[PDB]
Amino acid sequence: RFLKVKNWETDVVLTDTLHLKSTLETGCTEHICMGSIMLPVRTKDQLFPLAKEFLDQYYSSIKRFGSKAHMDRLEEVNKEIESTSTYQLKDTELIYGAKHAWRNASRCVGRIQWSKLQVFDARDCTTAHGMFNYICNHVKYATNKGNLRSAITIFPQRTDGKHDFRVWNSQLIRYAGYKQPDGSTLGDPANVQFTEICIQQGWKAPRGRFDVLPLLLQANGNDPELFQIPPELVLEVPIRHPKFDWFKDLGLKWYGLPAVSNMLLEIGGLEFSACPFSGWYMGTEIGVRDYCDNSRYNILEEVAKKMDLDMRKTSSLWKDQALVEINIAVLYSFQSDKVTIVDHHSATESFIKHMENEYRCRGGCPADWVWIVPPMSGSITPVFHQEMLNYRLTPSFEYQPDPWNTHVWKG
Amino acid sequence: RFLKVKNWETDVVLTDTLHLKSTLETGCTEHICMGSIMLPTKDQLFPLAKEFLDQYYSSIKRFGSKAHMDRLEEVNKEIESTSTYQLKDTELIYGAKHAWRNASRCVGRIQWSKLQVFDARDCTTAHGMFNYICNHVKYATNKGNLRSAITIFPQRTDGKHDFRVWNSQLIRYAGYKQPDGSTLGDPANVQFTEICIQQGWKAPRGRFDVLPLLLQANGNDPELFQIPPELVLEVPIRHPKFDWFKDLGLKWYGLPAVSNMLLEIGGLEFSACPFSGWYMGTEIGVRDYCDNSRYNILEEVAKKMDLDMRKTSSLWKDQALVEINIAVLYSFQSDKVTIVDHHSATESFIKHMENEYRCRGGCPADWVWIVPPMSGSITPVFHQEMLNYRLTPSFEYQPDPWNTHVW
Numbered sequence: 001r002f003l004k005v006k007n008w009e010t011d012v013v014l015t016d017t018l019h020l021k022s023t024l025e026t027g028c029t030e031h032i033c034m035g036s037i038m039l040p041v042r043t044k045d046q047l048f049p050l051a052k053e054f055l056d057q058y059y060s061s062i063k064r065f066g067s068k069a070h071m072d073r074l075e076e077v078n079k080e081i082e083s084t085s086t087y088q089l090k091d092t093e094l095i096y097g098a099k100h101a102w103r104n105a106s107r108c109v110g111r112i113q114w115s116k117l118q119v120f121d122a123r124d125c126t127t128a129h130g131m132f133n134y135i136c137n138h139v140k141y142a143t144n145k146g147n148l149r150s151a152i153t154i155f156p157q158r159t160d161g162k163h164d165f166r167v168w169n170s171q172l173i174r175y176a177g178y179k180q181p182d183g184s185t186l187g188d189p190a191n192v193q194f195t196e197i198c199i200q201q202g203w204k205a206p207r208g209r210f211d212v213l214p215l216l217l218q219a220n221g222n223d224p225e226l227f228q229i230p231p232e233l234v235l236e237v238p239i240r241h242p243k244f245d246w247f248k249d250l251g252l253k254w255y256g257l258p259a260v261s262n263m264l265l266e267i268g269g270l271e272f273s274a275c276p277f278s279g280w281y282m283g284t285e286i287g288v289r290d291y292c293d294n295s296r297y298n299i300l301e302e303v304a305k306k307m308d309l310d311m312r313k314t315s316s317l318w319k320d321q322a323l324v325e326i327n328i329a330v331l332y333s334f335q336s337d338k339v340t341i342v343d344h345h346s347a348t349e350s351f352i353k354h355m356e357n358e359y360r361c362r363g364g365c366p367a368d369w370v371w372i373v374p375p376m377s378g379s380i381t382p383v384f385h386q387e388m389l390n391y392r393l394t395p396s397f398e399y400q401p402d403p404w405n406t407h408v409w410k411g
Numbered sequence: 412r413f414l415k416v417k418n419w420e421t422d423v424v425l426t427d428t429l430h431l432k433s434t435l436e437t438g439c440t441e442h443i444c445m446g447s448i449m450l451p452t453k454d455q456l457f458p459l460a461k462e463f464l465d466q467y468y469s470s471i472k473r474f475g476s477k478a479h480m481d482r483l484e485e486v487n488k489e490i491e492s493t494s495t496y497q498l499k500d501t502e503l504i505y506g507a508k509h510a511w512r513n514a515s516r517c518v519g520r521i522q523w524s525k526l527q528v529f530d531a532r533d534c535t536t537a538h539g540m541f542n543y544i545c546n547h548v549k550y551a552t553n554k555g556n557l558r559s560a561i562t563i564f565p566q567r568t569d570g571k572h573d574f575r576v577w578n579s580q581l582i583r584y585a586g587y588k589q590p591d592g593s594t595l596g597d598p599a600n601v602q603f604t605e606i607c608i609q610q611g612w613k614a615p616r617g618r619f620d621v622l623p624l625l626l627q628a629n630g631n632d633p634e635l636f637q638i639p640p641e642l643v644l645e646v647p648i649r650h651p652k653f654d655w656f657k658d659l660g661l662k663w664y665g666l667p668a669v670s671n672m673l674l675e676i677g678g679l680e681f682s683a684c685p686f687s688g689w690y691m692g693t694e695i696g697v698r699d700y701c702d703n704s705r706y707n708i709l710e711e712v713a714k715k716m717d718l719d720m721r722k723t724s725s726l727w728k729d730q731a732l733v734e735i736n737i738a739v740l741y742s743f744q745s746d747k748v749t750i751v752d753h754h755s756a757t758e759s760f761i762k763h764m765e766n767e768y769r770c771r772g773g774c775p776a777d778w779v780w781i782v783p784p785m786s787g788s789i790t791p792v793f794h795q796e797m798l799n800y801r802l803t804p805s806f807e808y809q810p811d812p813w814n815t816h817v818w
């Protein structure tokens with residue numbers, strides 16, 4: 001069965017067959033759509049079929065379906081599974097796996113880059129300290145003095161789920177958030193819970209508005225340990241506006257390397273619970289969400305004051321107006337310091353291209369519209385007008401519970 | 412099967428049970444979500460009537476009463492007899508108010524129970540339809556103190572006697588294809604502007620020509636009627652900051668009025684049921700003025716602002732888009748014509764959700780449509796999970812009349 005999606009600004013219709021290779025569930029039924037819901041230790045029993053399915057995909061992509069290399073590998077994985085209850089991926093399989101998890105990330109507007117991903121193989125890692133080293137090399141490589149390169153570092157897979165490798169931070173680089181006794185919050189409010197933990201764990205906190213959190217790494221199911229990323233490795237960018245000179249005086253800065261570290265990488269049934277990955281920022285992530293969400297740095301107020309906007313009525317659109325200026329400053333500042341960044345127009349336009357290309361060559365591109373459309377100026381980006389189908393392919397990046405909620409403390 | 416929705420900005424959680432009544436289907440499956448797709452007999456009729464009447468009599472605290480039982484029997488008999496049935500006035504108003512209450516794409520449902528309903532099932536001609544519409548337009552406009560309204564024409568019979576308003580909105584601007592390869596006026600309306608001319612309209616071929624009405628009664632060939640100008644309140648668009656703004660020659664009409672939908676109540680189908688409310692500011696400034704497939708004036712406005720349109724990076728489109736929307740809100744308020752901004756509206760809707768979850772057990776909402784086409788994340792609906800599902804009574808889409816009309 002074929003399914004068509006239309007672009008209502010260009011009248012271009014595309015056909016999806018890829019959705020037929022979808023197994024995992026969406027959360028939706030024939031009677032209910034849960035497309036705006038953010039969130040709607042494995043036996044040998046179900047492992048081999050997952051293994052086989054992945055391996056068939058792999059060998060097709062290399063144009064070796066049915067080959068002797070193909071079947072022998074299937075036989076090998078099979079026997080290793082029954083003997084050992086699990087199996088190990090070839091380097092080639094891991095690389096392919098990682099690329100594809102990205103490529104199936106329906107919520108990621110940046111997937112056009114998916115083939116150029118540097119994959120670091122950290123499957124030989126055994127300690128927290130070993131983890132820190134691997135992570136440091138990731139950051140240094142990825143940052144490349146401001147000319148950012150995509151990368152993922154992949155730690156050992158889950159075995160029995162009692163020996164999980166985890167990176168406790170949600171992102172590698174991120175600012176502390178401190179709740180004050182008067183109820184107010186210093187620094188990033190998203191990070192308050194995690195900051196408190198770090199402190200509890202032994203972190204001495206500078207207690208400022210932009211303190212780079214420490215790494216809290218957990219290896220082989222052991223209690224997590226703290227590490228301070230060498231400051232010289234953490235590229236930061238002071239935020240200024242090109243016309244407004246009082247903007248620098250807001251004392252705002254942001255870090256250059258966005259890197260998500262709390263997801264789970266599933267490949268061929270194997271679960272990699274520590275798989276931090278990094279790309280580069282689309283401006284709105286910082287300019288709209290990081291700075292302007294009410295539950296974050298919330299600088300709309302203070303920016304609009306300095307702009308002398310009529311804040312007396314929301315129908316003056318002072319909020320919308322300050323939002324744009326803040327986003328202008330973010331992009332200006334990153335381009336000035338030559339730190340890689342992309343604006344929401346450029347990025348959604350490329351996604352549209354990427355998407356068309358994916359229908360032509362792959363037979364579809366799973367995309368989550370609620371997530372793909374940027375959080376400001378929606379309809380003046382081409383994705384707004386683009387119909388999208390959302391479905392789950394493997395390999396895949398999945399959410400996983402916060403480790404402080406699940407961890408078994410040794411002592 | 413008792414679902415929960417979360418606001419991720421306030422941590423408020425609501426529990427949804429209303430979904431368990433949902434009858435119609437969504438387009439989605441366990442394997443695929445179609446949330447961003449724009450369009451995913453006596454034995455049929457009576458169960459339909461019963462469900463409606465049951466929920467109606469429950470709404471008036473006479474569930475299982477004699478009056479309830481009486482009516483259920485009365486209608487059952489009329490269906491057996493006439494194959495269709497007719498609604499009591501009370502049921503008709505309840506029905507229409509609730510189709511609005513159930514419209515998962517409408518950010519403005521907080522006002523749902525204050526809907527003026529004009530019963531027009533006694534109508535028989537297009538001239539007659541014109542008179543009903545004119546009255547609706549005058550009442551709703553109310554010299555700019557806009558009031559919500561719907562006018563309902565006879566229900567469908569055998570599908571050959573369908574009443575229809577061919578216009579997509581009662582009041583809209585013509586669109587003309589130029590020899591220039593370009594498009595003067597409203598591109599959304601180019602084809603309709605044709606058909607008007609084909610049926611005989613004499614187009615002044617301006618940019619903002621109010622389209623004529625093209626009304627269809629009892630399945631007859633449709634007729635043209637020009638709305639009295641004195642009933643079409645318009646707003647000249649000026650900016651409270653840029654004096655050059657007026658020179659762009661822009662204006663917009665004050666009464667938004669969807670006329671091409673099908674209203675379904677207790678199994679009956681009203682193919683002609685124009686309704687109107689008031690504009691959320693972005694509807695005009697973002698979509699109407701700035702969609703590429705519409706008036707597409709962003710280029711002209713940024714030029715007039717002398718912004719560096721050289722690179723997307725400057726966010727000149729974003730900068731202009733704001734100012735334009737500041738202007739639209741400014742113009743309407745300066746003329747005492749009701750309009751609401753996206754912050755006030757989305758905020759209102761959040762309140763409406765809280766009431767509905769409280770008093771009804773839920774409220775079906777379509778996130779992809781509720782979040783405004785600008786400044787998405789600085790409005791509260793953005794951070795609000797919504798469950799989407801189809802309750803009845805309902806407004807459904809229907810084919811454009813030209814494609815169907817037996818001539």
Ligand code: HEM
Nearest residue numbers: 102105107108109110113150152277278279280281282397
């Ligand atoms: C290189 C430039 C990239 C850009 C511009 C980009 C852009 C984005 C953006 C804007 C989001 C929205 C996330 C949010 O607002 O919470 C997102 C989500 C996502 N991206 Fe990317 N991305 C890039 C690279 C990557 C890479 C290298 C990977 C993996 C290897 C990836 C995988 C994902 C995944 C799994 C999500 C969903 C995250 C979630 O659901 O919380 N992206 N992407």
Ligand code: HEM
Nearest residue numbers: 511514516517518519522559561686687688689690691806
């Ligand atoms: C009174 C203030 C109202 C406001 C502020 C409002 C706002 C909106 C908005 C912004 C949309 C999305 C429109 C689009 O982008 O196409 C919408 C859709 C809709 N509205 Fe309302 N509306 C109002 C009144 C009404 C009334 C009186 C009714 C019916 C009696 C109604 C029923 C609907 C329906 C059925 C849709 C879906 C449109 C579609 O699917 O094409 N609304 N509304």
Ligand SMILES: Cc1cncn1-c1nccc(CCNCCCc2cccc(F)c2)n1
Nearest residue numbers: 038039108110171258259260277278279280
């Ligand atoms: C490094 C990267 C590559 N692609 C995107 N990113 C990126 N960088 C920096 C930050 C983020 C944010 C990722 N998403 C964070 C949202 C996490 C949540 C929180 C509550 C409910 C949910 F379903 C999900 N993504």
Ligand SMILES: Cc1cncn1-c1nccc(CCNCCCc2cccc(F)c2)n1
Nearest residue numbers: 449450517519580667668669686687688689
């Ligand atoms: C009067 C009113 C009350 N509530 C909203 N409106 C209102 N006024 C003026 C305009 C509109 C827009 C109606 N919806 C427009 C979408 C029509 C389409 C066109 C192509 C494909 C689709 F799926 C759907 N709504």
Ligand SMILES: C[C@H](O)[C@H](O)[C@H]1CNc2nc(N)[nH]c(=O)c2N1
Nearest residue numbers: 384385386387447448449779780
């Ligand atoms: C592609 C997407 O489904 C389509 O463009 C939708 C998106 N959201 C919308 N939201 C509103 N309010 N009105 C619209 O016309 C649309 N269009």
Ligand SMILES: C[C@H](O)[C@H](O)[C@H]1CNc2nc(N)[nH]c(=O)c2N1
Nearest residue numbers: 036037038370371793794795796
């Ligand atoms: C409830 C709602 O779906 C939720 O807030 C989503 C909306 N879309 C989003 N889109 C992106 N890119 N990132 C987000 O965190 C969200 N949040």
Ligand SMILES: [Zn+2]
Nearest residue numbers: 028033439444
């Ligand atoms: Zn869905």
